[PDB]
Paper text:
This study unveils the structural insights into human AE3, including the cryo-electron microscopy structures for AE3 transmembrane domains (TMD) and a chimera combining AE3 N-terminal domain (NTD) with AE2 TMD ([name]).
To overcome this obstacle and gain structural insight into the AE3 NTD, we constructed a chimeric anion exchanger, combining the NTD of hAE3 (297–671) with the TMD of hAE2 (672–1241). The cryo-EM structure of [name] was determined at an overall resolution of 3.35 Å, with both AE3 NTD and AE2 TMD clearly resolved in the EM map. The AE3 NTD comprises seven β-strands (a-g) arranged in a planar configuration, sandwiched by eight helices (NH1-8). In the [name] structure, the AE3 NTD engages with the AE2 TMD in a manner reminiscent of AE2’s own NTD-TMD interactions, with the loopTMH10/11 extending from the TMD into the NTD surface. Specifically, substituting Q618AE2 with E617AE3 disrupts the original contact between Q618AE2 and D1079AE2 in AE2.
Numbering used by the authors:
A (entry chain A), B (entry chain B): 314 to 430, 497 to 648, 672 to 855, 894 to 1221
The structure:
């Protein structure tokens, strides 16, 4: 006929006596894709587990179903009618004596019980998990003194009917299994109930039962279910490694089974990085996919979910801004400071969030840019060249290069930048955070020596070290608290997401308590003014501030433009690639050509006002994306979490940028933060961003004996001595890059990264196997 | 007949082609109580795992063995003869055409291969694991193109014979299984080989095959094996909680099976704490069990294993001695100091290790004794009583109470001291380590305030804190390194066992480097002299040093004697109970009556010379025992470690005591250790000993949601509220005890600690059920 299959919610009800000896059915276990048992002593629900059967119970079940009486497509609609029909058929099939007809019927008309039978508070919580269109089944297994032989009955109702006071949740029933036998047999009826329920909770078996017509089809379905099972021999499980191989073996077995099924069935039977050719094609394609959703981009942020992010993202886009800028003040003779960096961050962020194609990106100063800033400053103050005027021409060339790269569709080279260079560029970012911290500490200890009885203050070095260590430890332990197993589980996440503000506030109050001790503090000027209003204006003359600019450097400034373009391009395209994956349920569209052009043009224009260039960070962009995802609730117990949807809007980023811009009118309060707390946070970010990259783990695996290596796909398919050779080559390249960065040619490491782009292909294909590269240099997993 | 069963070492050899296309057998997996597989791509052995089967392969195996030809008790002794007989029987049973008799015969005399076929270095390393009296079996499965139907043969040799160049290790073979079939069938021969090998490596199946005589018994044994198995349904393993329930279910299933077997079999069929009554009976009983082994006790320590302990146990019995000895000097006006404590430790340790019944005990000053010392000092300097004379009479009463308690057999009350009071006592010991550290820190910060520009030194208050934190962190992280997964695994343990010496040495060097900063240092006097040689002699006059002693106190000193006897008795008896368990394979014997009498008598006599009393520590004794256990090497791969034996001797303890005694002639070197380094170790010992006691874990569970609780036996059998009530009732008693310890009646907390023994027997039984007490207050597990 039609018999459209539905998902099944299976319940086990067992007959038992009460304290007043009145017999009644009590619920014992429930199946929603996984078994859940009721503990007898404490009367609560245990954790979900895989439903492991036993073989003797399966044999007994097959024998019982072979000798039982089955009713198919019954026309009854009430419990008494179903019970009467069942007892009549049991009488017909010579299973129960007619004299007991009056007795056994009374056993099928008893009240049902449940652990929770206040009720709605858990009834709704269980109804959320169950799929919307699910049809339930009831298994009634128990022993009766007045019977002599076991009797079984399988009933499939013609139409779903809601039997009240039978199940645990209001779901219609479709199937009924009744078993009633004597108590002197060797069979365990709880085991038979568990076996039949685990059979019915399966996918293929329950579909077959939906489409079945007699007992032979039930036997065939039982054989089909048994074909793809795993038998575990009777041996003690001593260690823990013994049961880590079941998943892979089950995967292979079910793969073979599904391949056989697919063969039998066969016998029975918009890339965003593709270049078209039209000039500026990518720009038009990206605009005409994202702009029409403009109204929805604003209407979609009216919920508290989109208000709790702005509170702490503001604290993540601000801490580096006041840190990095300070460093520039120490490195460029206070030509570029915290005020200019904050103004540039705000001004570029608001425009990008109003006109960008991917509003979920937050842009700001990053690690590998201040190194280039310092290198260019060192080069400028060697040949008697003004530092701040050359940046104007660098930006002028950068704006032209961006247009050249966008006009001819060329933002597809990010496909050639594989994991080999991404993991090196992650170590560079995570090592210009630790080095600056451990250099500032040494400088502090040198300026204020530790002799006995401004410069030479008594208790300044050790106090700064203590503040740094305290801030780092607080920020680390709150991060570890975020993913722990304490507290109600939603306050846990909220507290764990405020690690940085809490750490900074605590370690600022501690230093505010201490009096009569000098600790260096932030330098934020009053009002809207340039950090050095004695040698620098707001607009830079493109011809020369103090002396006329040379004409040769006007054209010879092509090389630094190319290097900084390489840096910006890598840092932005990698982030856009990471954000717009398929695992993250990002609807609408992503912009690969409207982000590069906008960022580089804004940087080039902004460098005229003596403000730094910016590039989208790849760590706080992921944090911004994560803070906006909402997970589903219709997930079966014990199943892995599933992302429902990500709220895409351009209102949280705009508000965060505006807040960071307005954070300059509270300078009187921002001048009370000591300069060691910020470096504690600096070191914390540097250390904590290492987790995730495979280069770090393969570097760990150097010190581990080959017996203790994990079972990941890049360690169990390649020999140990080739994994170590790959790691050694990567380390050698990283060390060479650091050496060339630390010498007098510091403004050449972008060229070294571009030269490690094709080393991979040419050399590491001429050496390694075509099969080992897919294991070690894989882009997925 | 006889057919005595042995353990079985199963190997799987599969036919395959070489690069030169020459056919040969290659080893694929091996079974010693657990499966171990050879990876095809990398050619190395994977980790052990439980041998999970598949059902279709089992059905194919049953059908193949049903139609195969079996040879029982063959008289051949060489491979060619066995092959000839096998081919003849295959021809007899109409399985192989006679025309192919030659061809298949060749396939039975091909060279065998192995992963390691340098060979001896791993041959011995694997021969260690295999049991000495084990007999092996060889499984040969592969495909051939010249056959049309599968043929099988099972051969059991009459006597074990060493077949060279067949197995991987030189072990005699007893069984042979040969299977050869066409390559166009749907059967997978690797799976059949795995199935038959996992059958033959079982504990009951191989015995059944030993006693078997025909094919029907093989089928019966197959059914027996299948009876006690677990079937896992075809569902994906999504999470990780799914497979944590297999162990318990397997335990229950095997328990039922073994109960059935035992029922069928039935149908077919020196306490050391027992009082006798004779006076001093226990003393004689433990003397006559331990003294005769004197020569063995002295002859059993001639190995490097008994020499690496003395190196670091000396560093564990010394750090508290110079710490506690300092504190008493600050608390008793330098009447008892480091020198007196060190000398008492040495003098009592040597005598105890020379005459004791349990030499594996290290005695020394512990936490709850200095609290009583301080309380008695505070009581003495209130009524104008000399402090050092009263201890003489306290010892005089103690040496009488010990004799009274030993003469009438009374060292059996330790059975009534349950876990309820043991955990409270462990918290008391672990909370007098943190408190003293965090009080010394506050005192240091108060004496040297943090103002700007002996008392009032500039950089002392922060330097001491830095040193404490550094020492604690180093000592903690080396402890965590001891049980990590780095380094060759035997250097790892050696480095992890030297945490305290390394942590102290590094920071001593660091503070040595710093110049022109004052940090308070240890006060160890030169030569053999008392700590204060201006107000105290070496022999205390029992009548009064400065003024005559009152006569009323001479008799009234009974109460402190009891209040300190309780502490000594608990601390010694708990340690002796913990040490002499059954899990620790301690041979010879333990003395419950020769340790109490000796320790208390030595404490009473040693208090006449103005030296403190001592009681065995329950943490350093366990460390001493652990440092002397030697583990076995004959353990199958993947199995849990097993203790071979423990070297019991009275030479390492005597040497450690002598070293601690001689550590006073290096005072010029011990006076360079800053006093803030030792308190790091103090706090580390306080924090690190909380792990293990169930009170701490049940205190953690107050914050966990009921969803995240573990699966231990005391959380899944009692309701959550009736667990938190028990935890709160324990915390209330602990808080009351800590309150009575801090007021002006501080020398009464032993009475409170002994008043919680009848509380458990009277009150906590009238509230909690008889079944909840066995779950929460269990002595085992
Ligand atoms: C500014 C700093 C302030 C610090 C001052 C102190 C601050 C407090 C400091 C230290 C002590 C703190 C916390 C101790 C904790 C109690 C909660 C821990 C036990 C607990 O968890 O109980 C809770 C709540 O039940 C109560 O009513 C519990 C009733 C709590 C009693 C009231 C406590 C309120 C605070 C007491 C002190 C009040 C002090 C206020 C005075 C102010 C002084 C200034 C039961 O939770 P549940 O089982 O019903 O819900 C579960 C649970 O949330 C799971 O975690 C969750 O799974 P995950 O999301 O994966 O984690 C489940 O979700 P699914 O099943 O769908 O997957 C939920 O279904
Ligand atoms: C700089 C970074 C700072 C932070 C980094 C962290 C720390 C500071 C950094 C670096 C310092 C250290 C390097 C030390 C490490 C090497 C990695 C160890 C890998 C390794 O394990 O390889 C070893 C030996 O292989 C060699 O022959 C290896 C032979 C060549 C090794 C080098 C030779 C000289 C080493 C010293 C170098 C000298 C350097 C200084 C001297 C220069 C002076 C100017 C293979 O060991 P195995 O597989 O044969 O034996 C296993 C293994 O021991 C398992 O652990 C054990 O199981 P468990 O007991 O349960 O753990 C098995 O027992 P069962 O079968 O009964 O279960 C054994 O069967
Ligand atoms: C920068 C260093 C100090 C850090 C890490 C060094 C090791 C992880 C590397 C350095 C040299 C490497 C070896 C150098 C070359 C080879 C050849 C390599 O090629 C082969 O397969 C040998 C046979 C052939 O050439 O085909 C096998 C691994 C091995 C021994 C390497 C193993 C790993 C080693 C010891
Ligand atoms: C300040 C902190 C560190 C101390 C610990 C406090 C809580 C862990 C304790 C204090 C009071 C306890 C409650 C006191 C009384 C009861 C009644 C008790 O009632 C029953 O035993 C049920 C049977 C019946 O109702 O007769 C169940 C536990 C409960 C809720 C206890 C739960 C745990 C509480 C809240
Ligand atoms: C400290 C680190 C970063 C650099 C020093 C690396 C040297 C000292 C260590 C690190 C990794 C080590 C290797 C780790 C694993 C093996 C496999 C083993 O079967 C032979 C030795 C061998 C090949 C080790 C040789 C020594 C080795 C190369
Ligand atoms: C500082 C800490 C140790 C003190 C916190 C103690 C109080 C607030 C905590 C300790 C244990 C907690 C209990 C833990 C588990 C449950 C089970 C839940 O179904 C109802 C609430 C209840 C009963 C909690 C109530 C709050 C509780 C009693």
């Amino acid at each position: 006929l039609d018999r459209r299959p539905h998902e099944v919610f299976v319940e086990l009800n067992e007959l038992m006596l009460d304290r007043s000896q009145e017999p009644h059915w009590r619920e014992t276990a429930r199946w929603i894709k996984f078994e859940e048992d009721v503990e007898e002593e404490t009367e609560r629900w245990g954790k979900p587990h895989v439903a492991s059967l036993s073989f003797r119970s399966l044999l007994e079940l097959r024998r019982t179903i072979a000798h039982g009486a089955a009713l198919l497509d019954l026309e009854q609609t009430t419990l008494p009618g179903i019970a009467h029909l069942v007892v009549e058929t049991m009488i017909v099939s010579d299973q129960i004596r007619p004299e007991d007809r009056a007795s056994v019927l009374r056993t099928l008309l008893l009240k049902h019980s449940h652990p929770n039978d206040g009720h709605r508070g858990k009834s709704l919580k269980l109804l959320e998990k169950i799929p919307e269109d699910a049809e339930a089944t009831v298994v009634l297994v128990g022993c009766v003194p007045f019977l002599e032989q076991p009797a079984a009955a399988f009933v499939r109702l013609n139409e779903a009917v809601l039997l009240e006071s039978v199940l645990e949740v209001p779901v219609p029933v479709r199937f009924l299994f009744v078993m009633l036998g004597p108590s002197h047999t060797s069979t365990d009826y709880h085991e038979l109930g568990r076996s039949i329920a685990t059979l019915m909770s399966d996918k293929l078996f329950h579909e077959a039962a939906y489409q079945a017509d007699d007992r032979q089809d039930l036997l065939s379905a039982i054989s089909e279910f048994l074909d793809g099972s795993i038998v575990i021999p009777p041996s003690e499980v001593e260690g823990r490694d013994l049961l880590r191989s079941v998943a892979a073996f089950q995967r292979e077995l079910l793969r073979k089974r599904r391949e056989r099924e697919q063969t039998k069935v066969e016998m029975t039977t918009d890339d965003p990085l593709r270049r078209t050719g039209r000039p500026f094609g990518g720009l038009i394609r990206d605009v005409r996919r994202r702009y029409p959703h403009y109204l929805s981009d604003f209407r979609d942020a009216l919920d508290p979910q989109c208000l709790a992010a702005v509170i702490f993202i503001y604290f993540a886009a601000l801490s580096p801004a006041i840190t990095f800028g300070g460093l520039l003040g120490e490195k460029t003779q206070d030509l570029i400071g915290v005020s200019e960096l904050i103004m540039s961050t705000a001004l570029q962020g608001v425009v990008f969030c109003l006109l960008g194609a991917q509003p979920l990106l937050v842009i700001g100063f990053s690690g590998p840019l201040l190194v280039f800033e310092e290198a260019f400053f060192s080069f400028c103050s060697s040949n008697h060249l003004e530092y701040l005027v050359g940046r104007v021409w660098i930006g002028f060339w950068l704006v032209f290069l961006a247009l050249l790269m966008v006009a001819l569709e060329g933002s597809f080279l990010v496909r050639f930048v594989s994991r080999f260079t991404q993991e090196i560029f992650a170590f560079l970012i995570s090592l210009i955070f630790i080095y600056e911290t451990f250099y500032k500490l040494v400088k502090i200890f040198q300026e204020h020596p530790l002799h006995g009885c401004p410069r030479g203050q008594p208790n300044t070095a050790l106090l700064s070290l203590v503040l740094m260590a305290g801030t780092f430890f607080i920020a680390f332990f709150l991060r570890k608290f975020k993913n722990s197993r304490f507290f109600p589980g939603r306050i846990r996440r909220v507290i764990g997401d405020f690690g940085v503000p809490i750490a900074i506030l605590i370690m600022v109050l501690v230093d505010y308590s201490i009096e009569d001790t000098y600790t260096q503090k932030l330098s934020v000027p009053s009002g809207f003014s340039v950090t050095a209003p004695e040698k620098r204006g707001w607009v830079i003359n493109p011809l020369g501030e103090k002396s006329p600019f040379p004409v040769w450097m006007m054209v010879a400034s092509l090389l630094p433009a190319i290097l900084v373009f390489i840096l910006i391009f890598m840092e932005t395209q990698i982030t856009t690639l990471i954000i717009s994956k398929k695992e993250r349920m990002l609807q609408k569209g992503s912009g690969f050509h409207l982000d590069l052009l906008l960022i580089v043009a804004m940087g080039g224009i902004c460098a005229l006002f003596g403000l730094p260039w910016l590039a989208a960070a790849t760590v706080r962009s992921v944090t911004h994306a994560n803070a906006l995802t909402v997970m589903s609730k219709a997930v079966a117990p014990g199943d892995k979490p599933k992302i429902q949807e990500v709220k895409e809007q351009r209102v949280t980023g705009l508000l965060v940028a505006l807040l960071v811009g307005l954070s300059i009118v509270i300078g009187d309060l921002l001048r009370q933060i000591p300069l060691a707390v910020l470096f504690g946070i600096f070191l914390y970010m540097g250390v904590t961003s290492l987790n995730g990259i495979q280069f770090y783990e393969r570097l760990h695996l150097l010190l581990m004996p080959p017996k203790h290596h994990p079972d990941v796909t890049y360690v169990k398919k390649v020999r140990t001595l080739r994994m170590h050779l790959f790691t050694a080559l990567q380390l050698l390249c990283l060390a060479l890059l650091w050496a060339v960065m630390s010498t007098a040619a510091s403004l050449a490491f972008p060229f070294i990264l571009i030269l490690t782009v094709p080393l991979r292909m040419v050399v590491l294909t001429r050496i390694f196997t075509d099969r080992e590269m897919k294991c070690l240099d894989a882009n997925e997993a």
